Design a protein around this ligand. Structure first.
Ligand SMILES: Nc1ccn([C@@H]2O[C@H](COP(=O)(O)OP(=O)(O)OP(=O)(O)O)[C@@H](O)[C@H]2O)c(=O)n1
Ligand SMILES: Nc1ccn([C@@H]2O[C@H](COP(=O)(O)OP(=O)(O)OP(=O)(O)O)[C@@H](O)[C@H]2O)c(=O)n1
Ligand SMILES: [Zn+2]
Ligand SMILES: [Zn+2]
Lengths: 144, 310, 310, 144, 310, 310
């Protein structure tokens, strides 16, 4: 099940693989996609795995994986060969996928993409909404 | 052009200390020498999606004092744009084809910021967005502090009342924390304390602040006593009755006040400053309101007129 | 004087093709070269007996852009003139002693026409009278069509939505039927078809029109796609759900559209044009709204200023 | 690639495989899942394919696929051996997954599962809501 | 027990011909011989989430005529819900612990059916859910037809007015279609025609129906002339004026009516039936209303009492 | 006669342990053996000066289950008072000449107590007075605890949610404090903590209580988990979002709960309890509501009937 050309996101935690496909709309494409969910690892026990052909991800695109699969590996493959290996790093902004937990925030009713500034704290990640300027724990933002 | 020419004015957090000083210096100039035709032939939208008579009158007077024309609306209960059916996005997309600037107040946080994404080259001035920002209130407060105290550094500033929900006290604290050596006193019922995140910001900047249960503990060393309204809803009637004496001011409280001390209040003050305060030299809340005109003129002038005001 | 000097502007049916062209030519001139003092010292009444924020802002901005002063009112629920106790006749008889022109919107058909019988030498401009006329909407629509297509003759014009109750689509059809060689496409649910009397008028003038169940049947040959709001009340919720896909537009629908084609909508468009349309070169509804300013300036200038605009 | 035991859903139309995974909550398990999207089909040009190990679908579950993958085939597998092939047939009834198009239907605001009676017509499928009793074309109910 | 014991009464679509006959026979018996203590010690909730004085008075009267006690509310701006945020599910979960039966009217379709999923063993009787069902109106209509005509088969039934949006006529048409040899005459403005789905249902069962533009075409043959209200809102004021003469009834129109012919109307009538019809032996709309009492009694009795003791 | 005969029921503070036990024993008896004619010929006023559909339906149902007749009203914008200017004193002076008992809910604290001073020999039962008392809610809560747990002493009771403004939790805490060996767990946002006066009362009687930040800390030991509504208004929208997870309950949270454990909630719940809790054997909020009927019956019976005939 190896691929000649494209991207392979490996070492995704279980129950995150499908979440990644949903959030980042990865299946909205004509390219061939192969997916393994609940694969044995030993490298970590169980894992998910996503292979997207003829498709590559920018450094920031990889960084958007941080909140969900901080320990993943993004591999670049060309001519059946692994040319690039990358790990997500906390980005400075997260757009589109998060929802602001402030119910009176203007973002909810309106034709805009959500946007949060990312601030690493000691024990967690602080997300500050571009619109309402309220800051929340990532735990709170991710809950819903 | 001046640093604020054609800029949106949304949040105090987006304004540097230099920006603040520039607004204040322009306000002093227009106060000292009016320019009634500066904005001749400009048309400004006064869009009060959330009604606010005092803020709207203040803003519109400032527009006229610079010679601008004004169109607008205010929503008590009903308009089918910016809220009801039409998106705020669409409302702004339309209004920004009519006018040269948009002054807007709105009940939801982020509203003015969202406006900027649909206003094209038309500047947006935030007249208040839910419990988030109210930058021109803070600008007029700072102008008043600078005018009466001669500076914005090394001050003793007391804030009294609903420190938890007062959007006005939060931004004034952020603003004053852009300057050096300020010391804060926070007098508030425990149910209504200054939020931790404000406290964290002061700590990080090495700015001293303390909590006090009553005004008298600090009356002798404050330069600025900034009072706020405690609306009755935020507490239960018996709870209100129990604590209220801590956040109400009367003239006798001022016996040991410094000569330079001024009492400010963004208004209305009905429930926390006794009328016997009005005639003391410390009462400065109406002068403060009057300064709203000069601060709001300065901002309009800076945003709409390329050249610095002389 | 110009042909429209001191004339009432009540109905599209009272305006000739030459009048239309004159308004449009004046609108192009003011757009290209503003005259901010043309109506200096005129006082115009903005009388919105029926509220309409978007139309009122548009009209009042136009008044200010020509330097006129503005007095007015807008009725959400309560005013005791023009409706409640006092006759509209009496209200106009009074207001026409204060002002130089009356712009009025009213919930009953014929209201503006009735105003002219009591306004003496004061001109009345109809800003909408019930389900009858809305001549300045039609004027701004025509200006926008002329500007983007270079002409008002020999066009392919599609009208979509509530063709039965849309006063705006009825007058645009009458207006366009004063020009030559226009061909119409009517896309509407059977419950909301273009009324027979409009069809009879086209037939008598030998103007081609056809009915279509969906936008795609004609997308390839239209120069103008004019969309309208289908308000939910005009149908039952399940009925609405059943048919709505025929009168809603999204960007993918535009794949085979002519390069010159523009999508217009008198607004608000919340329920029928997807936001993904906004960034295409065909989206022209906000530009259309912006043109309201120029069309309404032209009318005010022509009615209140003796000399033709240069 | 081959599996020892479970279910293989083959000949899913492109852009339906991910739909199936979402609507029918297929990835909510600890069982190994292998997915192939936009695969070449000599019969369809392109197809989607889902394999779920140690998991089996009843006849009605297979029928619940009829609206989305009418020409799919479901393979029951044991010991590397296909031991049963079945095809979706139109069920009498469709629950949980559909949303009623009537905006005034009580179903929207309320802790109940959507439910539709299925009735085939010459050129579409009529879907009648259990709650509001209005009937709609499937093309309207399915409408994004 | 009887077939209807402890059954929910939600939709005419759920009731067989036998069910309808049973309700109607029970109504005739209670009408001839009242049983004012049948439901002694029962408590019934009268829950009008949507207000309807006419329906509510009638239902509650029925409850008292059987000796039941009543608790309830009528909503839109007064009740402690439907403004708040508690699910209808929770409201029923609570109320069904209190009472022996729930009679409910609600603005959303499906509401009564949802109620049954949360009422445990407490029967729910639908007093109307949005534009869906109102089965007790249909029951009282059927009882009135059967009583005046002596049968429910082989009838000539004209329905006049707003046939598109009449929940009442759709239900009555479905009900009568459970019987044999009935023929229908539909007399309605084109904008307000009987919906196709009803016509398809009639076609499928070989039931004859025809459209007619005036009552006169069918008067000599009609057994039941069922008039409906035409809501002025559902047409434009001019449109109404042009077609209203073909859905309006006056005494002169009845000259060639059969002796057995009855005029029914679910009420209120305003325009549809001239007051001069009232004194003719054909007017039966008030007697129809009166029959709501017996139809609604029969339903409560059958649902809450195992064995027909009558 | 019984200790409660012709007594006013105003405050839990006025009811001794014996009183509470008597109400609860009477409730159990009426629940096992109804007495639908006990209060035949009695008329009871149901006076909701403040509207409360939930409480009013429950109370009136109780009245009818004992055979009493009911007259009454529910207010805020409809009743002929509380807008007018007649004293509550005069209203009671009138009403107490009509009826055998007055059940009243009112927006001001003390209202029911004042009523007793004007009702002569007519008993007043408080259905809630401002933020003061609601003793029949407390009675139904206690009856539910006693019935599910078999006792009111030696319990572990967790209270979760808005403990600061919950009239219901204060009353329940005082009530349980009349019994022995009870232990309390308070789980609330700091802004909404159980008030100090309640804590002082518990300290004074040697009753153990502790604060906990999550349900998980006490789940294994809890007999009664009493959830309350957190009014979104009583927090700022962001504040709510940050702490709400610690007052929200879902089925997974119950994994290590004792077999006897019951989840109670005075209702409405919106967010606080996930619907998945509903099917577990621990959910008892609907059964609790149902018990309001028996607690309220027992109270009416004891107050209006000399001798326990049961
Ligand atoms: N033509 C290829 C080459 C490799 N892979 C996949 O890319 C991932 C990483 O490849 P490789 O570095 O060769 O394996 P490892 O050394 O084990 O990488 P790691 O240490 O990160 O696990 C593996 O999941 C492998 O299946 C692939 O799908 N197609
Ligand atoms: N141990 C097995 C056996 C079969 N399959 C899958 O099950 C499907 C059907 O199996 P099979 O009938 O053997 O292939 P076909 O003949 O192509 O079936 P069909 O004619 O239905 O396409 C194939 O996609 C195959 O990959 C599998 O994954 N593991
Ligand atoms: Zn936000
Ligand atoms: Zn539905």
């Amino acid at each position: 099940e190896a691929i000649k050309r494209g991207t392979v996101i490996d070492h995704i935690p279980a129950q995150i693989g499908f979440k990644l496909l949903s959030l980042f709309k990865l299946t909205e494409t004509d390219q061939r996609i192969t997916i393994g969910l609940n694969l044995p690892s030993g490298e970590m026990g169980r894992k998910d795995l996503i292979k997207i052909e003829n498709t590559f991800l920018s450094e920031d695109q990889v960084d958007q994986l941080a909140l969900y699969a901080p320990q993943a590996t993004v591999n670049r493959i060309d001519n059946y060969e692994v040319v690039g290996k990358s790990r997500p790093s906390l980005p400075e902004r997260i757009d589109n996928v998060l929802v602001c937990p402030n119910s009176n925030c203007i973002s909810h009713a309106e034709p805009v993409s959500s946007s949060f500034a990312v601030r690493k704290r000691a024990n967690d990640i602080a997300l500050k909404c571009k619109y309402c300027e309220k800051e929340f724990s990532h735990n709170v933002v991710l809950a819903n | 052009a001046n640093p604020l020419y054609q800029k949106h004015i949304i949040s105090i957090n987006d304004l540097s200390r230099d920006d603040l000083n520039l607004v204040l210096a322009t306000a002093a100039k227009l106060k000292a020498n009016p320019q009634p035709e500066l904005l001749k032939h400009k048309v400004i939208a006064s869009c009060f999606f959330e009604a606010s008579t005092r803020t709207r009158l203040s803003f519109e007077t400032s527009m006229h004092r610079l010679g601008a024309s004004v169109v607008g609306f205010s929503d008590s209960a009903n308009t089918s744009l910016g809220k009801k059916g039409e998106t705020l996005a669409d409302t702004i997309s339309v209004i920004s084809t009519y006018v040269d600037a948009i002054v807007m107040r709105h009940p939801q946080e982020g509203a003015a910021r969202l406006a900027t994404e649909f206003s094209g080259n038309v500047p947006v001035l935030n007249a208040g967005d839910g419990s988030n920002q109210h930058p021109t209130q803070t600008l007029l407060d700072l102008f008043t502090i600078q005018e009466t105290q001669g500076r914005l550094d090394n001050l003793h500033v007391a804030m009294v009342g609903d420190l938890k929900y007062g959007r006005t006290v939060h931004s004034l604290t952020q603003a004053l924390a852009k300057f050096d050596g300020n010391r804060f006193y926070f007098i508030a019922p425990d149910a209504l304390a200054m939020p931790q995140y404000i406290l964290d910001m002061l700590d990080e900047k090495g700015i001293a602040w303390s909590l006090h249960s009553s005004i008298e503990e600090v009356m002798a060393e404050v330069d600025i006593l900034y009072m706020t309204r405690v609306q009755k809803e935020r507490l239960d009637p018996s709870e209100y009755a129990n604590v209220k004496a801590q956040f109400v001011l009367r003239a006798s409280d001022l016996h040991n006040a410094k000569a330079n001390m001024k009492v400010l209040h963004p208004l209305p003050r009905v429930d926390e400053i006794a009328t016997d305060v009005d005639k003391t030299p410390h009462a400065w809340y109406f002068q403060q309101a009057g300064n709203g005109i000069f601060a709001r003129q300065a901002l309009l002038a800076l945003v709409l007129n390329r050249d610095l005001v002389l």
